[PDB]
Design an enzyme around this catalytic site. Structure first.
Site, PDB file in Angstrom:
ATOM      1  CG  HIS A  64      -1.630  -1.270   1.537  1.00 19.33           C
ATOM      2  ND1 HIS A  64      -2.597  -1.784   0.686  1.00 19.33           N
ATOM      3  CD2 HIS A  64      -1.578  -2.107   2.585  1.00 19.33           C
ATOM      4  CE1 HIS A  64      -3.080  -2.914   1.179  1.00 19.33           C
ATOM      5  NE2 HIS A  64      -2.493  -3.126   2.344  1.00 19.33           N
ATOM      6  CG  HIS A  94       2.892   5.913   5.571  1.00 20.64           C
ATOM      7  ND1 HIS A  94       2.604   5.794   6.901  1.00 20.64           N
ATOM      8  CD2 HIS A  94       1.815   6.524   5.000  1.00 20.64           C
ATOM      9  CE1 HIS A  94       1.388   6.271   7.137  1.00 20.64           C
ATOM     10  NE2 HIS A  94       0.884   6.713   5.998  1.00 20.64           N
ATOM     11  CG  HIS A  96      -0.802   8.550   1.503  1.00 19.68           C
ATOM     12  ND1 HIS A  96      -1.593   7.420   1.535  1.00 19.68           N
ATOM     13  CD2 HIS A  96      -0.448   8.793   2.805  1.00 19.68           C
ATOM     14  CE1 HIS A  96      -1.722   7.011   2.781  1.00 19.68           C
ATOM     15  NE2 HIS A  96      -1.016   7.798   3.560  1.00 19.68           N
ATOM     16  CD  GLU A 106      -4.079   9.580   2.293  1.00 20.67           C
ATOM     17  OE1 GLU A 106      -3.712   9.517   3.465  1.00 20.67           O
ATOM     18  OE2 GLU A 106      -4.695   8.666   1.694  1.00 20.67           O
ATOM     19  CG  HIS A 119       0.369  10.463   6.521  1.00 19.76           C
ATOM     20  ND1 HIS A 119      -0.649   9.726   5.917  1.00 19.76           N
ATOM     21  CD2 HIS A 119       0.054  11.777   6.310  1.00 19.76           C
ATOM     22  CE1 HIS A 119      -1.506  10.542   5.345  1.00 19.76           C
ATOM     23  NE2 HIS A 119      -1.105  11.798   5.561  1.00 19.76           N
ATOM     24  CB  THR A 198      -6.032   8.091   5.101  1.00 23.06           C
ATOM     25  OG1 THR A 198      -4.691   7.616   4.917  1.00 23.06           O
ATOM     26  CG2 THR A 198      -6.038   9.431   5.848  1.00 23.06           C
TER      27      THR A 198
HETATM   28  O1  6M4 Z   1      -2.449   7.051   6.462  1.00 25.11           O
HETATM   29  B1  6M4 Z   1      -2.580   5.810   7.176  1.00 25.11           B
HETATM   30  O2  6M4 Z   1      -3.972   5.392   7.113  1.00 25.11           O
HETATM   31  O3  6M4 Z   1      -1.712   4.704   6.637  1.00 25.11           O
HETATM   32  C1  6M4 Z   1      -1.196   3.807   7.614  1.00 25.11           C
HETATM   33  C2  6M4 Z   1      -1.357   4.568   8.873  1.00 25.11           C
HETATM   34  C3  6M4 Z   1      -0.821   4.210  10.108  1.00 25.11           C
HETATM   35  C4  6M4 Z   1      -1.077   5.051  11.177  1.00 25.11           C
HETATM   36  C5  6M4 Z   1      -1.834   6.204  11.042  1.00 25.11           C
HETATM   37  C6  6M4 Z   1      -2.352   6.549   9.831  1.00 25.11           C
HETATM   38  C7  6M4 Z   1      -2.109   5.715   8.724  1.00 25.11           C
HETATM   39 ZN    ZN Z   2      -0.846   7.687   5.603  1.00 26.69          ZN
END
Ligand code: 6M4
Ligand code: ZN
Ligand code: 6M9
Ligand code: 6M9
Length: 260
Positions: A64, A94, A96, A106, A119, A198
């Site tokens: 992902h 990570h 997006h 996002e 993030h 998300t």
């Molecule tokens: O942006 B995400 O949903 O991707 C993995 C994740 C992990 C922790 C918090 C938010 C997220």
């Molecule tokens: Zn994320």
């Protein structure tokens, strides 16, 4: 080849509610940040990002995104202050990103989409670990940073250069001695609101802290994100692009600004 949620037409954001009905919940993320209706909150504290003792371990393609993972077994890289009560420990970061420079973020800002969004994920130490934290409405604090395409970000380059070694889902590689402070902009001015993951399971456990100032990365750096794969090795190639969820309804929430 495996059964999984993803970002395709057949398994993407419009389908997720069937397995995760919270997708239509009251505090879903991301959202559009209407800068004109966000209210300056003089009660908010300066944000304290304390990453000097961070211990990165590994980089993983989870099918992902890619996650850069940290040793979160001691108070080494923590976020506190701002809207937060207590202390949140960095577990991973990570991104997006899009198939094109005009999309990928996002969150949006007055409907503006950035090329990508970082993030930095932290869990509330009062709950002992990440797994327990995601069962709580204040379990996580995510620091969101927008990426625009312009000058290179030198602090990103070590990440870009290892991506070829984790092309496919399930691959990992050592990623020690990385300083995540090189991914931050100069200013810590932010917006904050209560939201969710998300990605499935879409749990409503996040205090979002979205920085106003984007970082710039080069065209060459973001191109390398786009050569990653959603698929496993030996499976047909599907480029890891457009791994973003669109903005969701704000509902009965207010977005607060840390600045005037
Ligand atoms: O942006 B995400 O949903 O991707 C993995 C994740 C992990 C922790 C918090 C938010 C997220
Ligand atoms: Zn994320
Ligand atoms: O479980 B599934 O993973 C991917 C996919 C595509 C189409 C239909 C079902 C699935
Ligand atoms: O509920 B689902 O509808 C389509 C799909 C594809 C993959 C995983 C879950 C779902």
């Amino acid at each position: 080849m495996s059964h999984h949620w993803g970002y395709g037409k057949h398994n993407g954001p419009e389908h997720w509610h069937k397995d995760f009905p919270i997708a239509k919940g009251e505090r879903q993320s991301p959202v559009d940040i209407d800068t004109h209706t966000a209210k300056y909150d003089p009660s908010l504290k300066p944000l304290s990002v304390s990453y000097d003792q961070a211990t990165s371990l590994r980089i993983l393609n989870n099918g992902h995104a890619f996650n850069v993972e940290f040793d979160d077994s001691q108070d080494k890289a923590v976020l506190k202050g701002g809207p937060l009560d207590g202390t949140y420990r960095l577990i991973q970061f990570h991104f997006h990103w899009g198939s094109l420079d005009g999309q990928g973020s996002e969150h949006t800002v007055d409907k503006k989409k950035y090329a990508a969004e970082l993030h930095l994920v932290h869990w509330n130490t009062k709950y002992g670990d990440f797994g327990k934290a995601v069962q709580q409405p204040d379990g996580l604090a995510v620091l969101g940073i927008f990426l625009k395409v312009g000058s290179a970000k030198p602090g990103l380059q070590k990440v870009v250069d290892v991506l070829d070694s984790i092309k496919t889902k399930g691959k990992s590689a050592d990623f020690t001695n990385f300083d995540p402070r090189g991914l931050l902009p100069e200013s810590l001015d932010y917006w904050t609101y209560p939201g969710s993951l998300t990605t499935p399971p879409l749990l409503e456990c996040v205090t979002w802290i979205v920085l106003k100032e984007p970082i710039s990365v080069s065209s060459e750096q973001v191109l390398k994100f786009r050569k990653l794969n959603f698929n496993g090795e030996g499976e047909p190639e599907e480029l890891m692009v457009d791994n973003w969820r669109p903005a969701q309804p704000l509902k009965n929430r207010q977005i607060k600004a840390s600045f005037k």
